[PDB]
Design a protein around this ligand. Structure first.
Ligand SMILES: Nc1ncnc2c1ncn2[C@@H]1O[C@H](COP(=O)(O)OP(=O)(O)O)[C@@H](O)[C@H]1O
Ligand SMILES: [Mg+2]
Lengths: 114, 114
């Protein structure tokens, strides 16, 4: 079940290859990137959503740090869609979904600038 | 209002020729609460009040007056309104951690959920 997070491919995957896979900048370029998290285990689903949400956020965060240096209008605006947004972001303070709550909230407060 | 204590930043809505002064002696020392919706113009109203509080002087001197205004600018918008001001972002602010009290220092380092 955890081959996507702990397989042999996950060991040898490049950090660059992860971002272009999540954002669709790889060999096959697409505007929409469907992240089918149907078969992800529920005790792992919070972990995978939180990591992708953070990785996309610092992609936009680190883009603004070169944008001040580059001072040129070349932007990559990103919109993330959360079907079942109440699930990864509940108001309950129970420990099962805190990581996905913190990642989505970080895009909610600071993602507008980035 | 006396002519010395008059502070004008707005005019009457149904009569633009009628200036509406406030007691600027009493306008500032007692706290101000500017409330509106997003897109109602409360950032402009804040900016216009502070510009009127800066360019005004006793006329017996040339230079900066004694206004001291601190803006907790969070949307990165008041840089344009006051070009001759001191702006402190993350890359320029140096806030010492040791000036934090015990309550602030707990939130910076500990976790409260566990
Ligand atoms: N007194 C005013 N007269 C005319 N236009 C205004 C006035 N105040 C604000 N606006 C316009 O309305 C828009 C709303 O911005 P603003 O009220 O500053 O945002 P917010 O209320 O969300 O802080 C601004 O783009 C500005 O051009
Ligand atoms: Mg505003």
């Amino acid at each position: 079940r955890l081959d996507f997070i702990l397989g042999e491919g996950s060991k040898s995957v490049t950090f660059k290859e992860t971002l272009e896979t999540l954002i669709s900048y790889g060999k096959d370029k697409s505007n929409i990137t469907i992240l089918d998290v149907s078969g992800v285990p529920f005790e792992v689903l919070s972990i995978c959503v939180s990591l992708i949400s953070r990785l996309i956020f610092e992609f936009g965060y680190h883009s603004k740090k070169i944008k001040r240096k580059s001072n040129e209008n070349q932007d990559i605006p990103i919109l993330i869609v959360y079907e079942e947004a109440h699930k990864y972001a509940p108001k309950s303070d129970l420990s099962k979904y805190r990581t996905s709550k913190e990642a989505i909230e970080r895009i909610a407060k600071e993602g507008r600038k980035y | 209002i006396d002519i010395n204590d008059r502070f004008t930043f707005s005019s009457l809505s149904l009569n633009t020729k009628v200036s509406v002064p406030v007691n600027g002696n009493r306008f500032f020392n007692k706290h101000i609460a500017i409330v509106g919706s997003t897109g109602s113009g409360k950032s402009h109203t804040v900016a216009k009040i502070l510009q009127k509080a800066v360019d005004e002087k006793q006329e017996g001197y040339k230079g900066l007056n004694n206004s001291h205004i601190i803006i907790f600018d969070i949307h990165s918008e008041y840089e344009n309104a006051f070009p001759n001001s001191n702006v402190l972002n993350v890359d320029t602010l140096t806030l010492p951690y040791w000036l934090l009290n015990g309550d602030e220092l707990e939130e910076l380092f500990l976790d409260t959920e566990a």
